[PDB]
Design a protein around this ligand. Structure first.
Ligand SMILES: [Mg+2]
Ligand SMILES: [Mg+2]
Ligand SMILES: [Mg+2]
Ligand SMILES: [Mg+2]
Ligand SMILES: [Mg+2]
Ligand SMILES: [Mg+2]
Ligand SMILES: [Mg+2]
Ligand SMILES: [Mg+2]
Ligand SMILES: [Mg+2]
Ligand SMILES: [Mg+2]
Ligand SMILES: [Mg+2]
Ligand SMILES: [Mg+2]
Ligand SMILES: [Zn+2]
Lengths: 143, 171, 206, 59, 36
RNA sequence: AUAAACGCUGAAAGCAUCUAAGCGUGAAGCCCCCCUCAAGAUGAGAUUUCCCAUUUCUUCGGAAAGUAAGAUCCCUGAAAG
RNA sequence: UGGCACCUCGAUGUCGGCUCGUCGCAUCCUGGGGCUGUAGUCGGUCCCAAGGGUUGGGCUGUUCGCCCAUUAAAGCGGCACG
């Protein structure tokens, strides 16, 4: 019958700047993972990309409650026999703050072909300055 | 904690958020703190406060007063740590500023004064450490004593003035 | 540090002052010219580009005629880079001579090994043979390829393939005699590669 | 339809659970298919329905 | 140091403390030092 | 930078305590240093240099057809296979 | 060492050795440390630690075992008793 379905390019996609100082790692990522998805628009369509672009600054000041700065471990395997490598969350925040936030959000997005598309929509900067001033983003206040 | 301290003559105190500093004849010191204590400023009887009074506040109450007491008294009198040498052939020179110890090793060991702490060696069998930081002065003396701690049989090695060295009787 | 490029000429031996006899390697290092300097601002890393042998203008093409024209030199055949080297020296277009080294220096030699074709396990990886008698039929074979449980064969199960041709460096290799009229430099020991092969000489890293 | 009514209702300081309670408590019997249609095409009328939902919740 | 699941004082001069979130006994006699 | 371990200052608890806030030493181990591969790292990076803006058709995406810098087919070969 | 009899009897090859290894730590050597009935040399016990290393022969089909001679040491187990 008659139910509205969006089309690629029909919905205007905006740019947002989110400041991430003091916010918990998983509380920030959960809200960002639904901005990219498009779950805040009545034009939502499950099979079409209709979200927004998100820029995250101050990625080095993210929050890690409790003993997560030492007891949280990130694992990687190279598929060679006995090639398991690990890094704590505390030093990852110190050295590579951009990788910590990308790994968290990437697990919060659908694990399909369109879920990879939304990942390329995210830019994370460990400092306080971003290179995307030509796109004229706005300041988005987290709820 | 909750006690009071007295600013001596020549000592100045300024505050900036959780950061404080003290200038005195011996030198100057700087430190950070936790904002939740809200240091109480007075004419001279400086203290702090406990806005919450729970488990993690009574512990933090005492430390703030005690260390500021250390910081203030540090620039007025200074801190001293004394050491002695026991054992035949255990005897130390002084080559200018570097401290040299002959403690029976096949090689000598060298020591250098840190930033703001001074080592003097009055007698060949005694060593004195002085500085305007209790934390720094105490640490330096520990490193010197750690070369050869007092062995329990004949008392050989560096020691403090009041170490009740446990003594055994081998064989 | 310092570095030059050269061609492997061969091997011979010399007699030292003490009377001992040692083998040496002969290096031809003519026509080295500094071509380009790479800075942090321009590139992000510090390096110097060196060109080794001139070649006929027919073999050189248009794009590399203009690359060497900045340093005012004829087109070269080998071009490489050296890192962790001081940049106060090395003016553009300056010749680089063998006398930047001296007697009894310590260098590192980098080159491309000699080529062997399709080689089996006991020559490529130095494995063992099976018995050649007592009724066996296992002579020069790889071996068991792993346990049953994984349902697959792991990685780094060493197997035949093309053997040589990789880049190999040899460290802490001493220099015996240096000659500036012949542009000849003598290194005690062996360096990888066949005759006429490029050999990159650099000061020891350790 | 539920995910589209939710997204439109949040723009008016509401949520789906607390909006659909207001409508029942006020007597409106419009189903999800029609409610989502207004939220996308004629958002002007969706707000009029949402205002009545807020009145039912308060009184 | 004795590492056993049953740390308890042996003499009258023994003391029980807690460091780094575990129970241990420190005493003047070095033979009495225990950790859980 | 750490494990076990040894300490400094220090309160809860006016004393004491290596701990709770904060600091210092401390392993053939961890990350580096060393050697090799590595931009299909679809996140496909950077630098130096070279060629330049032609002709037929278009109603529109654009289509084709001689070239420039450059490469290859073909032939003599080995330091490669 | 056993108990059960759940997949396989229109076939799941069964001991020992050879070639090739990889993993666990309840550590044989090497590294750091606490206690000692730790004077010194030589040791004993426990904590952290899996990076590397961990022999050649005589007898027996032998795994194992005994013996000769060495070594810093001649580890214990899993992978269809790989
Ligand atoms: Mg190359
Ligand atoms: Mg045969
Ligand atoms: Mg490129
Ligand atoms: Mg020939
Ligand atoms: Mg069958
Ligand atoms: Mg263990
Ligand atoms: Mg040991
Ligand atoms: Mg011991
Ligand atoms: Mg090991
Ligand atoms: Mg015989
Ligand atoms: Mg079995
Ligand atoms: Mg078997
Ligand atoms: Zn006791």
């Amino acid at each position: 019958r008659t139910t509205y379905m969006a089309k690629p390019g029909e919905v205007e996609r905006k740019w947002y700047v989110i400041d991430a100082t003091g916010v918990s790692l998983g509380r920030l990522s959960s809200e960002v993972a639904s901005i990219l998805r498009g779950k805040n628009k009545p034009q939502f369509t499950p099979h079409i990309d209709t979200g927004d672009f998100v820029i995250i600054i101050n990625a080095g000041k993210i929050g890690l409650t409790g003993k997560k700065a030492t007891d949280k471990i990130y694992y990687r395997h190279s598929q060679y026999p006995g090639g398991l490598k690990s890094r704590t969350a505390g030093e990852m925040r110190t050295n590579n703050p951009e990788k910590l936030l990308e790994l968290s959000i990437k697990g919060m997005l659908p694990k399909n072909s369109l879920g990879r598309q939304l990942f390329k929509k995210l830019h994370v900067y460990g400092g306080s300055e971003h290179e995307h001033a030509a796109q004229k983003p706005e300041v988005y206040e987290l709820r | 904690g909750k006690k009071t301290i007295v600013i001596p003559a020549g000592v100045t105190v300024t505050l900036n958020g959780s950061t404080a500093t003290v200038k005195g004849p011996k030198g100057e010191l700087v430190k950070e703190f936790n904002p939740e204590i809200t240091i109480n400023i007075e004419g001279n009887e400086i203290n702090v406060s406990r806005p919450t009074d729970n488990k993690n506040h009574r512990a933090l109450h005492g430390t703030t007063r005690a260390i500021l007491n250390n910081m203030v008294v540090g620039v007025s009198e200074g801190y001293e740590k004394k050491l002695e040498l026991i054992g035949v052939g255990y005897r130390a020179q002084k080559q200018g500023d570097k401290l040299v110890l002959n403690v029976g090793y096949s090689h000598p060991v060298e020591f250098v004064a840190p930033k703001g702490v001074e080592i003097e060696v009055p007698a060949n069998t005694q060593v004195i450490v002085k500085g305007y930081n209790k934390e720094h002065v105490g640490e330096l003396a520990a490193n010197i004593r750690a070369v050869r701690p007092p062995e329990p049989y004949k008392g050989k090695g560096i020691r403090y003035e009041g170490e009740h060295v446990r003594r055994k009787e081998g064989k | 540090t310092k570095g030059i490029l050269g061609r492997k000429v061969g091997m011979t031996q010399v007699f030292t002052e003490n009377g001992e006899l040692i083998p040496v390697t002969v290096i031809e290092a003519a026509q080295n010219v500094v071509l380009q300097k790479k800075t942090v601002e321009t590139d992000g890393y510090e390096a110097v580009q060196i060109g080794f042998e001139d070649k006929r203008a027919k073999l050189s093409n248009k794009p590399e005629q203009g690359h060497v024209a900045k340093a005012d030199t004829t087109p070269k055949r080998f071009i490489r880079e050296f890192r962790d080297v001081n940049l106060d020296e090395y003016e553009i277009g300056a010749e680089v001579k063998v006398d930047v080294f001296a007697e009894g220096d310590i260098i590192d030699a980098t080159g491309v090994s000699k080529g062997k074709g399709f080689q089996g396990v006991i020559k490529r990886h130095g494995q063992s043979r099976g018995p050649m008698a007592h009724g066996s039929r296992y002579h020069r074979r790889p071996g068991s390829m792993g346990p049953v449980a994984p349902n697959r064969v792991f990685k780094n199960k060493l197997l035949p393939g093309r053997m040589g041709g990789e880049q190999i460096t040899i460290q802490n290799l001493e220099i015996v005699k240096v000659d500036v009229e012949k542009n000849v430099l003598l290194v005690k020991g062996n360096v990888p590669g066949a005759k006429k092969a490029l050999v990159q000489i650099k000061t020891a890293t350790k | 339809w539920i995910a589209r009514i939710n997204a439109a209702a949040r723009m008016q300081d509401l949520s789906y659970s607390k909006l659909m309670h207001g409508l029942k408590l006020a007597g409106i019997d419009i189903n999800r298919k029609m409610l989502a249609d207004l939220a996308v095409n004629d958002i002007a009328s969706f707000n009029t329905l949402a205002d009545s939902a807020k009145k039912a919740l308060a009184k | 140091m004795k590492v056993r699941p049953s740390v308890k004082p042996m003499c009258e001069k023994c003391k029980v403390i807690r460091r780094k979130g575990k129970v241990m006994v420190i005493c003047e006699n070095p033979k009495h030092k225990q950790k859980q």
